[PDB]
Amino acid sequence: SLSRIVYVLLLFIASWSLYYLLGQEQDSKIQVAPNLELPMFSGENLENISYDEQGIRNYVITSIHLDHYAKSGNTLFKAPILKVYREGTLQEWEITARRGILSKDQVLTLYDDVLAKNLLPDSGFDTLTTSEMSIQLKSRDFWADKPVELRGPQFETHGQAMKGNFADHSAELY
Amino acid sequence: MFKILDWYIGRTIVATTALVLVTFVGLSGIIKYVEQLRKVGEGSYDLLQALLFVVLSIPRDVEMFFPMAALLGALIGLGALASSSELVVMQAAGFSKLDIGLSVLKTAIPLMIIVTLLGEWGAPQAQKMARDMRAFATSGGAIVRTGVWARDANDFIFIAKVENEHLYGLNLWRFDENKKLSTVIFSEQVDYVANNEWLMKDAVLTRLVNDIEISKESLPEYRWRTSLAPDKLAVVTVKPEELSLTGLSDYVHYLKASEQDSSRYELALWRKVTQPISIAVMMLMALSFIFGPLRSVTMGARILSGVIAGFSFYISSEFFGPLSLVYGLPPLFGALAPSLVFLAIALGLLGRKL
Amino acid sequence: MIIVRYLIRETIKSQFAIFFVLFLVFLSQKFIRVLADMILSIVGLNMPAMGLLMLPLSLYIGILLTFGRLYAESEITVMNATGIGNKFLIRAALYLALITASVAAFNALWLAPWSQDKEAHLMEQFADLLQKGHFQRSPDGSSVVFIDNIENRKLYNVFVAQLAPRDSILPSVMFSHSGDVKEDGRQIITLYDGTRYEGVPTRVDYMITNFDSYDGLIGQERDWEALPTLSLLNNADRRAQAELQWRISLVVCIPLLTMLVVPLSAVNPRQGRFAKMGPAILIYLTYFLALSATKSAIEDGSLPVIIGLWPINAALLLAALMVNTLDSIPVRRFKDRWKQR
Amino acid sequence: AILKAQHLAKSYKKRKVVSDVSLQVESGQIVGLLGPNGAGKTTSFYMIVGLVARDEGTITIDDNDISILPMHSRSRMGIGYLPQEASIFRKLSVEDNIMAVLQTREELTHEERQDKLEDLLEEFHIQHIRKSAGMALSGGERRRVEIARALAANPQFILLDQPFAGVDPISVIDIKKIIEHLRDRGLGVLITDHNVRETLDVCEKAYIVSQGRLIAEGTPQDVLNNEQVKQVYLGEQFRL
Amino acid sequence: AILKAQHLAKSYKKRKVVSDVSLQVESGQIVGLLGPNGAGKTTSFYMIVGLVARDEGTITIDDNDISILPMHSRSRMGIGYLPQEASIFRKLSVEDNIMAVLQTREELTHEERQDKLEDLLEEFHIQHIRKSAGMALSGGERRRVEIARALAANPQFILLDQPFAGVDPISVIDIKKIIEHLRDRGLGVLITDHNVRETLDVCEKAYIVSQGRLIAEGTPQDVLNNEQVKQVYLGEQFRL
Numbered sequence A: 001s002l003s004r005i006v007y008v009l010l011l012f013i014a015s016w017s018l019y020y021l022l023g024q025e026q027d028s029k030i031q032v033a034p035n036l037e038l039p040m041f042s043g044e045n046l047e048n049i050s051y052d053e054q055g056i057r058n059y060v061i062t063s064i065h066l067d068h069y070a071k072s073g074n075t076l077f078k079a080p081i082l083k084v085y086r087e088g089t090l091q092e093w094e095i096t097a098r099r100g101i102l103s104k105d106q107v108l109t110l111y112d113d114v115l116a117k118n119l120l121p122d123s124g125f126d127t128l129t130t131s132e133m134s135i136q137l138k139s140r141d142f143w144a145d146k147p148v149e150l151r152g153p154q155f156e157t158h159g160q161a162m163k164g165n166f167a168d169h170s171a172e173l174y
Numbered sequence B: 001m002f003k004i005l006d007w008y009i010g011r012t013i014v015a016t017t018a019l020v021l022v023t024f025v026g027l028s029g030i031i032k033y034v035e036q037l038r039k040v041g042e043g044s045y046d047l048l049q050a051l052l053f054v055v056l057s058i059p060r061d062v063e064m065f066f067p068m069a070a071l072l073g074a075l076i077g078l079g080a081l082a083s084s085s086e087l088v089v090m091q092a093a094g095f096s097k098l099d100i101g102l103s104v105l106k107t108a109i110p111l112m113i114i115v116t117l118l119g120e121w122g123a124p125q126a127q128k129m130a131r132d133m134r135a136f137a138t139s140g141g142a143i144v145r146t147g148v149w150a151r152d153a154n155d156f157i158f159i160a161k162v163e164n165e166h167l168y169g170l171n172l173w174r175f176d177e178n179k180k181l182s183t184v185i186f187s188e189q190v191d192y193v194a195n196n197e198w199l200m201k202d203a204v205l206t207r208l209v210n211d212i213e214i215s216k217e218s219l220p221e222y223r224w225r226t227s228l229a230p231d232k233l234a235v236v237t238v239k240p241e242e243l244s245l246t247g248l249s250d251y252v253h254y255l256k257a258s259e260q261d262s263s264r265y266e267l268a269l270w271r272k273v274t275q276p277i278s279i280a281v282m283m284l285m286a287l288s289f290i291f292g293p294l295r296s297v298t299m300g301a302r303i304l305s306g307v308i309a310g311f312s313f314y315i316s317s318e319f320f321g322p323l324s325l326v327y328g329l330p331p332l333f334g335a336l337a338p339s340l341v342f343l344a345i346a347l348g349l350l351g352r353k354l
Numbered sequence C: 001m002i003i004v005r006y007l008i009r010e011t012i013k014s015q016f017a018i019f020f021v022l023f024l025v026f027l028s029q030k031f032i033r034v035l036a037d038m039i040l041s042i043v044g045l046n047m048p049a050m051g052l053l054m055l056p057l058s059l060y061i062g063i064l065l066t067f068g069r070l071y072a073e074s075e076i077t078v079m080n081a082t083g084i085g086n087k088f089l090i091r092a093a094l095y096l097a098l099i100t101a102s103v104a105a106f107n108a109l110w111l112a113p114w115s116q117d118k119e120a121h122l123m124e125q126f127a128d129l130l131q132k133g134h135f136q137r138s139p140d141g142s143s144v145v146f147i148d149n150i151e152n153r154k155l156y157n158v159f160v161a162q163l164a165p166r167d168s169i170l171p172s173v174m175f176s177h178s179g180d181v182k183e184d185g186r187q188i189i190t191l192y193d194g195t196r197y198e199g200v201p202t203r204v205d206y207m208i209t210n211f212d213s214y215d216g217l218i219g220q221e222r223d224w225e226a227l228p229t230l231s232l233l234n235n236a237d238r239r240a241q242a243e244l245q246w247r248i249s250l251v252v253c254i255p256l257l258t259m260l261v262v263p264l265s266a267v268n269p270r271q272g273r274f275a276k277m278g279p280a281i282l283i284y285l286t287y288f289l290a291l292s293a294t295k296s297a298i299e300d301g302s303l304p305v306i307i308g309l310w311p312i313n314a315a316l317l318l319a320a321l322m323v324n325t326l327d328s329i330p331v332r333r334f335k336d337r338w339k340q341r
Numbered sequence D, E: 001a002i003l004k005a006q007h008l009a010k011s012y013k014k015r016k017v018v019s020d021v022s023l024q025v026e027s028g029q030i031v032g033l034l035g036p037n038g039a040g041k042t043t044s045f046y047m048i049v050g051l052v053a054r055d056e057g058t059i060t061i062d063d064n065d066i067s068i069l070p071m072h073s074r075s076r077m078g079i080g081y082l083p084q085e086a087s088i089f090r091k092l093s094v095e096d097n098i099m100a101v102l103q104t105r106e107e108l109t110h111e112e113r114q115d116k117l118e119d120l121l122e123e124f125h126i127q128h129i130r131k132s133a134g135m136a137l138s139g140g141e142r143r144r145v146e147i148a149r150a151l152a153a154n155p156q157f158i159l160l161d162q163p164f165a166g167v168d169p170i171s172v173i174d175i176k177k178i179i180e181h182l183r184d185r186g187l188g189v190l191i192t193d194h195n196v197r198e199t200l201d202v203c204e205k206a207y208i209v210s211q212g213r214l215i216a217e218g219t220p221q222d223v224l225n226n227e228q229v230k231q232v233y234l235g236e237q238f239r240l
């Protein structure tokens, strides 16, 4: 039947146009454009706890603002608070500042007004302050290249360019 | 029970609804074929595989279209009898309008049996076969089940490879009443031992305590007492309307057991239950038309009224569905509410004739 | 002529009736789609779009049903038997087409742009990325999101799973109590009152982040329907010219559809007044779907803004000529050659 | 054995189509209901048949009111109806036609039904087409099968709508002979038609409806000589 | 002029309804196309009219072949058609019906249109019905109005489809008189009808079509004595 052949051809064109229109609005919705170099994760009032390869609480960073980046793996803290733990059950140190940077290699860096208290009330070392300080939470080794001030319970000193670790309380400078 | 006038009306009505139903599946079929043309040549998906997909998906179209087909079939067949003066002389010789209506119902019975048999065995198995064939042909050996997620109460499970009764690379996360993660399980391979019980080989289990202790144990085997059977897993990805009846019933039982909202699947279950009721309502509405307004009108006006009534029924179905669950009503009522409404219309139109 | 007016009278009656139905139907669905997502004003401003789409179909079905009726009760047969041919039917149809085309022209060039412009002002003034119930995936595809309830943004109970490493971030799984989603060249999600667990089921070194608020990434020309037509006539742009060509193709399609459907309405009394409903609606659907598809193709720059929607209208015009010469003496001598041979 | 109709009236679109019509048919009697075309005869016929709801009057068989009754119940009372149009069951055999109606008599056993089938086939000389489908039958055989199908319901009255319309003269004698066979069976036949000559030649009583009401009744000779009848229906010269 | 049909044939669903049917009507002659019911006369009449596409045979008015011509074209050739059913424009006045048909003749003027309208009204005695809409007219008045309408087209032949259908014998003479008025107006009238008696009374020549073919032709006495006609159509004891 010639009329029925034309009707079928018309149904072909109709189906094709409809599904072309659906595909067009799909591509308009399937426009997944890759994002730009910006903080991929953000949070406020954060407490991020980190553990060692055996399951023991290594340290705690309590900050008011945290931004995790993807390309480099640098995690920027605003006003961080770092609690170091000996075997997880004893909070030995507590190190704070206004700005911090974690790295993919687990290397922290603290900039504006650094404070560092020792929760051991009998060891003779109580408080430490400096401008900028980097510490490797894994090894606990820390570097500082700017003014340093130490306050002991009966002895206070003032120097610069310190390098130690909270692992063993090994401190070293000149 | 076997009355000549019964099977006479029946034979004319099924003849007409068969024609109507062939025509409907033909038109939906060629539309599906252009949809498959939208994405041919992907992997091994040549035009033969697309034609194969369209042919396989036919019984699901038949189930979806059987209600309206029986509306139009009854309308045309009874209109035929009507216009050749056969119904009039049937009444003028004793056969009442009540008897005509019982003839229509007696021949609605086999149609209801066929549509439930389709809903149970034919359309779901054929639909899963079309989907699987299309996916395998379309990705050249990339689709069984790779990347499966599931939930059992507060547990979240992720399986990497799923076989007939074996899982490969299981991960599982448990959460407590405080919505925090307590235990995590991983296993290279898990097998299905008995009813509602799995066995994981060389499984590593991690538990969290006091936010200072995390202890993992490399157990040779671990027993899993979940209400999540492998059948249920293999059906968490298909559309509920495509799942069989007994499958829907087992799935709503599992959903109710795992403390999950089983409304949508209950609604799909009751919609599969009420599909045959809908086709009987559709045939009585046709009889109400043939006796009522469309008594001495041309077949074209009967067919156009039937199309309008079928379209309005489909819309009412797609409306009563969600509103029954968002307003808190049993899915049974949300499923059979359109059937009731059109039944009331049919009885109203037959209230003065019958 | 007497009989021409007669046809117009009958047809315009039926036409208005059909319009009173069509408009009503849309006045239903639109007013329901609006209440789901004041309402009176927005529906009143959406009336011109209903008119744009419905005026063609209105006159189309009107003359189809009217002439069908006259063919059924044989008035057209008697008019042929006395000497009233296709000329008078086509003259009456062209007059009704001219009337409805003038209405559609005003609705397409002034009323619809001015109404959409007013709606644009009112929208400037006054005022669903992921679903619930099952495991969703973000447009990124790197995170699997599972939400329990989304009830006006109230009680979420979100679960986010990320089993793949992005560039330098480790896999993680976080669970919170409530979280929002928003879209601003990117799509983001925020979580409230939860904990995030960074690690792997086999290893034990985790990082737990207890957060009150935490954000995450999910994914990443101009309005042409509302504009003054005179300023659009010379606004050189692909999609702009596509919109202008759609507006003009509606007004030009009114008479083409009329001339096509006049020969199509012929039915014998055994057939119905409705026997050409299938084919007629199929023809209308194919035309408008192809027209809309070519419009979007111009908008994409896929095909140039210089040929535009002309070929679709041309195919409609050629078709109307074909069906209108289908009763002449040559085609009847051809068909008879086939019958006797 | 008496189907009575008393003071029937029906209106349409606020105008009265039948004002006053009365008629009676007895067992053993052939009665025609004639008159000008559209004058009221047809509507009255259908009011007896049950296709038209009466607005007034009574229809009666043996002092039983069948006015408010639907058509299938009037049949159960003893009224048969043969429509002018072809009403045979097209895709059914002659056998199954008659058997289909015998089956609606639940008091009949199967053996009784088949006995009546045989008798009705042999009676109206349609044994040889018993296997034929209804749609495969010429006009005369169709009407014979439709007669036997009607009689399978065992009626007391047979109402024939226009049994002479478009009938060849060589077939008029055969229709009359069938009418007379119904009458000698005990039925009461009520015939409505436009062919006055043939109807008056078969019927033994006639009624004439004109201008909406009965204007004459009696034997054909009586109604042929009525003045109002010749003034509105037959004319000054009417050959019989 | 002289309208003629030669060796006509037609089929419906592979069934031969008309196999060999020839007839002609000349200007000024009444011609009856008669024969058994549905044995070919009616389909032959409709092939001549144009309502049925001929399958075989030739239809010529004045040696000009109009077979393939659609209705409108063979109406401009000089063929009018008056169907059995009511063909009047219900929503138009009698004045407007006739003027609407006269408005097609472009060779006439407005004054000549008015003149021919006035003549057609006072000729068919419908000057009083002038301004009445067609939907409000009785049987004979409607027929006069539509026959005056048909004559507005200035035909040469008038094809009447069953003009004696269901007619009260009073009106029979009235339509006989209008048929012979047509004939005396210079037309050739082709009658097709089932009323053998009334047609044979009016027509001057008669063609008898039975079993698809022309079986007898000639004057009314010629066919009345034709033995085949007497044995398949009219009966031995037929009475004109």
Ligand SMILES: CCCCCCCCCCCCO[C@@H]1O[C@H](CO)[C@@H](O[C@H]2O[C@H](CO)[C@@H](O)[C@H](O)[C@H]2O)[C@H](O)[C@H]1O
Residues within 6 Å of the ligand: B012, B015, B016, B019, B020, B023, B072, B076, B077, B080, B081, B083, B084, B086, B303, C278, D090, D091
């Ligand atoms: C988009 C359109 C959707 C609707 C589908 C289109 C219509 C589908 C086909 C239906 C039309 C065919 O309609 C056909 O009519 C014939 C002739 O009347 C019917 O035939 C009928 O004949 C007589 C009465 O007429 C009855 O006694 C008989 O029992 C019955 O078969 C057929 O039962 C039906 O098949």
Ligand SMILES: CCCCCCCCCCCCO[C@@H]1O[C@H](CO)[C@@H](O[C@H]2O[C@H](CO)[C@@H](O)[C@H](O)[C@H]2O)[C@H](O)[C@H]1O
Residues within 6 Å of the ligand: A002, A003, A006, A010, A013, C263, C264, C266, C283, C286, C287, C290, C312, C315, C316, C319, C323, C326
């Ligand atoms: C993108 C393009 C969009 C525009 C689409 C235009 C589609 C045009 C569809 C044309 C439809 C023709 O299909 C249909 O064919 C039949 C059969 O030949 C024609 O029928 C024709 O021939 C038959 C017999 O052969 C006659 O009885 C009939 O009177 C006559 O019209 C119809 O009149 C026409 O409607």
Ligand SMILES: OC[C@H]1O[C@H](O[C@H]2[C@H](O)[C@@H](O)[C@H](OCCCCCCC3CCCCC3)O[C@@H]2CO)[C@H](O)[C@@H](O)[C@@H]1O
Residues within 6 Å of the ligand: B296, B297, B301, B302, B304, B305, B306, B308, C073
């Ligand atoms: O039967 C033939 C009769 O046709 C007409 O009457 C028409 C009347 O003008 C129309 O109003 C009604 O309905 C026409 C068809 C129904 C209209 C809408 C039906 C619905 C059904 C499907 C959904 C939408 C449309 O039909 C009768 C015919 O039966 C003429 O007036 C009368 O001379 C002629 O004898």
Ligand SMILES: OC[C@H]1O[C@@H](OCCCCCCC2CCCCC2)[C@H](O)[C@@H](O)[C@@H]1O
Residues within 6 Å of the ligand: C018, C021, C069
């Ligand atoms: O029969 C003559 C009468 O016909 C009347 O038609 C009635 C037509 C009404 C039918 C409605 C059909 C629906 C319309 C909407 C789409 C779906 C179908 C004339 O209007 C009157 O003028 C005249 O009196």
Ligand SMILES: [Ca+2]
Residues within 6 Å of the ligand: D111, D112, D115
């Ligand atoms: Ca016996």
Ligand SMILES: [Ca+2]
Residues within 6 Å of the ligand: D195, E195
């Ligand atoms: Ca007669």
Ligand SMILES: [Cl-]
Residues within 6 Å of the ligand: D037, D038, D039, D040, D041, D042, D043, D044
């Ligand atoms: Cl009457």
Ligand SMILES: [Cl-]
Residues within 6 Å of the ligand: D123, D124, D177, D178, D181
């Ligand atoms: Cl006998």
Ligand SMILES: [Cl-]
Residues within 6 Å of the ligand: D194, D195, D196, D197, D198, E169
């Ligand atoms: Cl008579």
Ligand SMILES: [Cl-]
Residues within 6 Å of the ligand: E037, E038, E039, E040, E041, E042, E043, E044
């Ligand atoms: Cl014939």
